[PDB]
Design a protein around this ligand. Structure first.
Ligand SMILES: CCCCCCCCCCCCCCCCCC(=O)OC[C@H](COP(=O)(O)OCCN)OC(=O)CCCCCCCCCCCCCCCCC
Ligand SMILES: CCCCCCCCCCCCCCCCCC(=O)OC[C@H](COP(=O)(O)OCCN)OC(=O)CCCCCCCCCCCCCCCCC
Ligand SMILES: CCCCCCCCCCCC(=O)OC[C@H](COP(=O)(O)OCC[N+](C)(C)C)OC(=O)CCCCCCCCCCC
Ligand SMILES: CCCCCCCCCCCC(=O)OC[C@H](COP(=O)(O)OCC[N+](C)(C)C)OC(=O)CCCCCCCCCCC
Lengths: 124, 52, 82, 44, 85, 246, 163, 83, 243, 106
């Protein structure tokens, strides 16, 4: 009932007991269940939309809030590509010219025809 | 494990392990010294190839 | 630098596309000397110092070029204002 | 000030003192300086 | 490998509590000695004892049985039930 | 390709040194916070993993100098002007490469002990099947970068048949146009920060163990994989399962 | 002596025989079987690298046609280039050290017939990822190393987090 | 560890700790089959291997470039570089 | 088995035999409705597989997703897609009834209930069934050398000729067919052997004799898809209308 | 919420366990740890003279939130225990006879 999809299934159930969905992972492990593997007593009512709250369900972290976590991830993505873009204005220039090649730019060596000399050839 | 509260005894390694350590460390610092000596102007950045 | 090769000679010795310039003449004994040995670092040091030095002499004219090409940038920047 | 006073003795005894924690940090150094000195003097 | 026994657990917990300083005496310690009453420990000193018990054995325990181990024989019979060392 | 080659001989030795110091504990634990002083007890895996770490931080004699620093060099020598940014972008990573290798060399070998003491009584080494591959990979991770530096690096080496566009080829530029400062600076500051981490661990040690509320939110960000495992899991996987239930 | 089919087929032997004859041979024999065939794979590829330093021409082989329709043929072509032999002496050396390293590290592991099968298998579909001479065999090895990367790190099927 | 295991289940890769009593005998069969397979495959794939460079002559390639130029000339096809 | 291996490939045969050679001009106006419908069966029905409590229903929707790949190879009006859809029809008809022998064949004979939630830890007491779980699943996903990938590859390529944006979107099916099949495979294969489950027999001689036939007959097509080009090379041409 | 009793003791012993554990995983260098543990001890010893229920509950949930701030990303788990890495490597299979399903074979 916590999530917006669990709320959206209230009018379907008619005889279903409608229990509180709680993750199988955030139960403690030290209580001795029937199923130590999945943290579940033998006859325990499964939830509306169980397989998101299974042990085989996703990992479901519990340290940050997911909204905060979204802010911190996009914050690192912003602080990298903003700083690396601003730092292209503070770049120093090169001390050397680009090097050069003979034979009118090696136009003939990388393919080429006399009419076709524009597409092939570098730095005459 | 006689003295839980006492100081710990000196370890017993066998002969082969400790001579292997001495061989590997000797070859490491020796090879480092050779490659620093042979490439010292190149590895340091000396004799720049810029024109005067 | 040594003399530039002919048109055919680069095709004969199978020099890579980027290794063909006015300094490529010392390369065609160097790689062959490398093939005589097994590309080993202690062997064949003379000709690689030669090719290196030919290329240092090719680098200094590049630096002198790019030094020259900065002067008229300043000159046109002073002349376009006045 | 220390309820477990004599507990953390062996954290700092002669096995784990400041000199023995850095004892064999460079095991072949004292041999390699000698052999590199001999190679420096024998290359000429 | 290395397999513990009962007397090993015994000598480790006795030499454990002899290192601790808010005990009453180093001489009145038994297998059956109450940590709270016989050793003169507080509500909160016995928890630090349990913390050292679980650090020094490797094994970690929940709070469901952290108060269960009131006497020393109960701590030993606890720790010899776990195959971790 | 040369870094891909020498990198295998780094890493396999790093992994099978870490496996040897995990296997040499009664508990077989993996947190570095629970190893302590293992220098006098395990000298063989010490000397192997310090071959590994000095290779990994590109120290002058070893294969790491030949295989890692010249990629940092080629950022300055390229013809695109914007690739001077990736010099410092790739440089920062080398200083950061030193600061965890000193963490793993200090906190499991040099520091005060941290386990119970049984694991210090039963600390020993493994038979011959764990010793001998570490020996051979140590030899390779020392010598193979100088031996094979004339086939992949070299100077006019027609060995691989890759066909660089000669308008994009910048290796002849990045060997010579490097001044003394930009080549000296990685080697030097890699060494210097590698001493600073050990000294700041051993003498002062309050710098790394502050209880700032602000620095530790940052530590908890970078501990949890730059939160992104949470991001990928909650915003894509879990939303994917929910919209497959819709 | 082909020095390609001994590079290819020999870890194929090292995979196929630990599974087919696993229960018959047992773990003590598969420790030394799986290792030494990768050892001799490894010392064939150093020798081929030494020869390839002599002249720069590779050997390829050509096998049976996979499929041809219009404008399209796909064969099983395996070619050991310079770019191939670099990675080849990387992965054979690293693998042949790991096959020896996991004899003493796994000496109390039960299921190490499957584990040495799986190590030599991951070696084999790397061996045909690297040396294939079309983008198809580069897909073949690319997927079967993904299949092994399922089957390897989920070695303890009992553990939840490994699965 | 050496925990107990059920001996009734029959795997193919061996089970938990497969160490049958005649593994020296079966090792001989396994090495015989492995060496037979390796030698037979290594001799069978000998004529399928060729040498990369130098398998055809230069004159063939020059005249195939010539025939390419003939066929290209007859259809009136500009160079890709020609615009 | 006879439904999913034979009744489904019949309409793959009937879109060739009935439709394509007298509806030649009515299709090229109207193939980009077939691409809509085939894509959003691949996108939709291979995404509803994820949330399925029953174990036979998953292999049912797997059949839907592969038959939705196949009919965008037929309706390509190109030459690789026709042969790719035929090799899909001959290889899915091998790999899929083997999976129905795994789900309602073996496992329903042993435990008579087909809910997924009871079934974990199949390895510890049935090793030589967990092998048939894995190699037959990894044959269904479209790992190469199995004859499903030759068909998936050529049909995605033929549907990439005809309209490349629909082929680029439809290429995601390799992912979407891996997701549910490997999620099922690692739920069944791994974990501690379940509480609910007494240990029953190993997979018996007949339920291996079926399986190895349905596995070799995929692997031969996966190693050589040309063993049936001698039949099909006229019907690769008999259905193209690209003038 | 209540003075000296078992219901307050079980709570504050649980919180003291958590306050030592959430500094165990938090720093290295045991010297600094056993220092910090002595002053955490002094924080519990200093404020344990409260004689009303209300300011007791105020300091109680305030230190519950203070302990809730300094949580750690991965607590130090021993490996054979369910956060650890040795957890359930080879669980020994239970001894079971073969339950049969077919009259005919097998
Ligand atoms: C722009 C550049 C693009 C480059 C990439 C950009 C980033 C993309 C990142 C997302 C893609 C990642 C691949 C998607 C598959 C994710 C699979 C997965 O992560 O499964 C893991 C999950 C269990 O893993 P976990 O519990 O975390 O393990 C913890 C171990 N201690 O196992 C599970 O149980 C999960 C089962 C569900 C799997 C996910 C289902 C949704 C998949 C989304 C695909 C979207 C397809 C939409 C198609 C629309 C086309 C119009
Ligand atoms: C392509 C090449 C041909 C296709 C592969 C040919 C393989 C033929 C023979 C397979 C034999 C595999 C096998 O027997 O593995 C059994 C393994 C038993 O595990 P075990 O250690 O004995 O303990 C179980 C606890 N009761 O059972 C298991 O634990 C499950 C692991 C299965 C490993 C199978 C390895 C082959 C997988 C290749 C994937 C091919 C996909 C196509
Ligand atoms: C960006 C870093 C900001 C937070 C770093 C931190 O404080 O992380 C901790 C580590 C110290 O080692 P620790 O044992 O993990 O400290 C754990 C104790 N805490 C939880 C209080 C932190 O700092 C470093 O090694 C990085 C310092 C050198 C970086 C040089 C570049
Ligand atoms: C197991 C690891 C790989 C082992 C490799 C062993 C190589 C042995 C020598 C092969 C010689 C060869 O295949 O010859 C190839 C022959 C004929 O082709 P060709 O035109 O004469 O020659 C080709 C050379 N060209 C191109 C230069 C001219 O076609 C075949 O055989 C195909 C038979 C396929 C049968 C159906 C597949 C059955 C697989 C079922 C598995 C469960």
């Amino acid at each position: 009932i916590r999530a917006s999809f669990d709320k959206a299934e209230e009018p379907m159930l008619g005889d279903y007991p409608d229990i509180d969905p709680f993750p199988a992972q955030l139960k403690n492990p030290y209580k001795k269940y029937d199923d130590q593997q999945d943290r579940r007593n033998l006859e325990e009512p499964l939830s509306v939309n169980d397989d998101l709250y299974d042990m085989w369900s996703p990992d479901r972290f519990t340290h940050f809030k997911n909204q905060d976590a979204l802010k911190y991830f996009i914050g690192f993505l912003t602080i990298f590509f903003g700083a690396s873009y601003v730092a292209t204005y503070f770049v120093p220039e090169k001390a050397a010219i680009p090097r050069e090649f003979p034979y009118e730019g090696l136009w003939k060596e990388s393919g080429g025809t006399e009419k076709s000399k524009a597409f092939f050839g570098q730095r005459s | 494990n006689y003295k839980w509260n006492g100081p710990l005894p000196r370890p017993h390694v066998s002969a082969g392990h400790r001579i292997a350590t001495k061989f590997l460390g000797a070859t490491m610092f020796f090879w480092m010294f050779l490659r620093i000596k042979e490439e010292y102007p190149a590895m340091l950045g000396l004799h720049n190839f810029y024109p005067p | 630098f040594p003399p530039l090769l002919s048109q055919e000679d680069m095709k004969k010795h199978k020099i890579l596309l980027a290794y063909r310039d006015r300094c490529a003449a010392l390369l065609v004994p160097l790689n062959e000397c490398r093939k005589k040995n097994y590309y080993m670092p202690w062997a064949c040091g003379h000709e690689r110092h030669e090719y290196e030095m030919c290329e240092v002499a090719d680098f200094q004219r590049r630096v002198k070029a790019m030094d020259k090409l900065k002067a008229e940038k300043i000159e046109q920047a002073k002349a376009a204002a006045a | 000030k220390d309820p477990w006073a004599r507990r953390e003795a062996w954290r700092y005894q002669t096995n784990f003192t400041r000199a023995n924690r850095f004892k064999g940090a460079a095991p072949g150094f004292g041999i390699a300086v000698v052999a590199f000195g001999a190679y420096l003097a024998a290359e000429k | 490998a290395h397999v513990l026994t009962k007397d090993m657990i015994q000598e480790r917990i006795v030499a454990l509590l002899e290192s601790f300083d808010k005990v009453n005496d180093a001489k009145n310690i038994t297998a059956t000695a109450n940590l709270t009453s016989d050793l003169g420990l507080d509500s909160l000193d016995v928890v630090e004892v349990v913390m050292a018990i679980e650090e020094e054995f490797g094994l970690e325990i929940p709070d469901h049985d952290a108060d269960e181990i009131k006497t020393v024989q109960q701590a030993i019979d606890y720790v010899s039930a776990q195959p971790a060392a | 390709l040369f870094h891909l080659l020498g990198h295998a001989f780094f890493k396999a030795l790093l992994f099978m040194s870490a496996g040897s110091i995990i296997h040499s504990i009664l508990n077989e634990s993996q947190d570095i916070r629970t190893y302590g002083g293992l220098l006098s007890y395990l000298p063989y895996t010490y000397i192997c993993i310090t071959i590994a770490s000095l290779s990994l931080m590109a120290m002058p004699g070893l294969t790491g100098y030949y295989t890692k620093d010249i990629i940092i060099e080629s950022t300055y020598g390229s013809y695109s002007i914007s690739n001077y940014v990736v010099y410092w972008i790739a440089y920062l990573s080398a200083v950061l490469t030193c600061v965890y290798s000193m963490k793993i060399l200090y906190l499991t070998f040099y520091s005060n002990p941290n386990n119970n003491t049984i694991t210090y009584y039963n600390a020993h080494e493994s038979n011959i099947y764990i010793t001998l591959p570490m020996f051979i990979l140590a030899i390779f991770a020392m010598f193979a970068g100088w031996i094979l530096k004339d086939i992949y690096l070299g100077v006019g080496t027609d060995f691989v048949g890759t066909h660089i566009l000669p308008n994009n080829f910048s290796y002849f530029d990045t060997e010579f146009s490097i001044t003394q400062f930009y080549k000296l600076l990685p080697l030097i500051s890699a060494i210097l920060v590698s001493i600073l981490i050990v000294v700041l661990n051993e003498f002062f040690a309050i710098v790394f163990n502050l209880n700032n509320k602000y620095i530790n939110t940052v530590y908890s960000i970078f501990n949890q994989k730059l939160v992104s495992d949470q991001i990928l899991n909650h915003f894509i996987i879990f939303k994917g399962l929910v919209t497959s239930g819709n | 002596y082909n020095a390609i089919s001994l590079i290819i087929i020999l870890p194929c032997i090292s995979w196929l025989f630990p599974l087919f004859f696993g229960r018959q041979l047992g773990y003590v024999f598969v420790t030394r079987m799986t290792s030494t065939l990768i050892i001799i794979t490894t010392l064939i590829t150093y020798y081929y690298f030494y020869q390839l330093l002599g002249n720069n021409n590779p050997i390829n082989l050509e096998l049976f046609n996979y499929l041809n329709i219009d404008y399209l043929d796909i064969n099983y072509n395996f070619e050991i280039d310079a770019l191939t032999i670099t990675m080849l002496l990387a992965i054979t050396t690293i693998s042949s050290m790991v096959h020896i390293y996991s004899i003493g590290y796994m000496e109390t592991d039960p299921h190490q017939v499957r584990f040495f099968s799986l190590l030599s298998m991951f070696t084999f579909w790397m061996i045909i990822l690297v040396t294939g001479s079309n983008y198809f065999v580069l897909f073949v090895g690319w997927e079967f190393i993904g299949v092994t990367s399922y089957l390897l790190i989920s070695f303890w099927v009992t553990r939840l987090q490994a699965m | 560890g050496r925990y107990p295991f059920p001996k009734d289940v029959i795997s193919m890769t061996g089970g938990w700790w497969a160490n049958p009593s005649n593994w020296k005998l079966n090792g001989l069969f396994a090495t015989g089959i492995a060496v037979g397979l390796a030698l037979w495959v290594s001799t069978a794939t000998l004529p399928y291997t060729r040498r990369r460079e130098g398998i055809t002559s230069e004159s063939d390639i020059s005249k195939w470039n010539a025939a390419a130029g003939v066929w290209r000339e007859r259809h009136g096809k500009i160079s890709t570089g020609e615009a | 088995m006879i439904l999913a291996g034979l009744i489904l490939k019949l309409a793959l045969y009937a879109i060739l035999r009935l439709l394509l050679p007298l509806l030649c001009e009515a299709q090229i106006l109207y193939t980009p409705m077939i691409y809509i419908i085939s894509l959003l069966t691949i996108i939709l029905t291979s995404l509803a597989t994820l949330r399925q409590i029953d174990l036979k229903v998953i292999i049912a929707y797997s059949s839907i997703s592969h038959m939705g790949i196949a009919i965008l190879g037929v309706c390509s009006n190109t030459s690789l897609g026709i042969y790719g859809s035929i090799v899909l029809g001959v290889a899915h008809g091998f790999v899929s009834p083997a999976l129905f022998l795994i789900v309602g064949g073996i496992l329903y004979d042993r435990y008579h209930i087909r809910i997924v939630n009871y079934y974990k830890g199949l390895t510890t007491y049935m090793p030589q069934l967990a092998t048939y779980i894995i190699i037959l699943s990894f044959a269904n996903i479209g790992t190469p050398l199995t004859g499903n990938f030759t068909g998936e590859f050529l049909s995605l390529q033929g549907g990439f000729i005809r309209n490349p944006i629909i082929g680029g979107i439809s290429c995601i099916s390799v992912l979407l067919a891996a997701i549910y099949q490997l999620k099922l495979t690692n739920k069944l294969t791994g974990g501690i052997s379940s509480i609910y489950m007494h240990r029953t027999n190993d997979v018996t001689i007949r339920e291996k004799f079926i399986m190895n036939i349905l596995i070799i007959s995929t692997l031969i097509i996966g190693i050589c898809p040309q063993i049936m080009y001698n039949l099909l090379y006229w019907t690769v041409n008999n259905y193209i209308y690209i003038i | 919420p209540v003075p000296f009793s078992a219901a307050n003791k079980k709570l504050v012993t649980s919180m003291y366990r958590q306050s030592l554990k959430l500094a165990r995983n938090w720093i290295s260098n045991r010297q600094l740890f056993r220092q910090k543990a002595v002053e955490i001890r002094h924080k519990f010893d200093q404020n344990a003279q409260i004689s009303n229920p209300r300011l007791l509950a105020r300091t109680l949930d305030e230190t519950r939130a203070h302990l809730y701030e300094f949580r750690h990303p991965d607590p130090i788990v021993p490996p054979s225990f369910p956060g650890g890495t040795k957890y359930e490597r080879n669980v020994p299979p239970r001894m079971e006879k073969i339950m049969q399903h077919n009259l005919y074979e097998p």
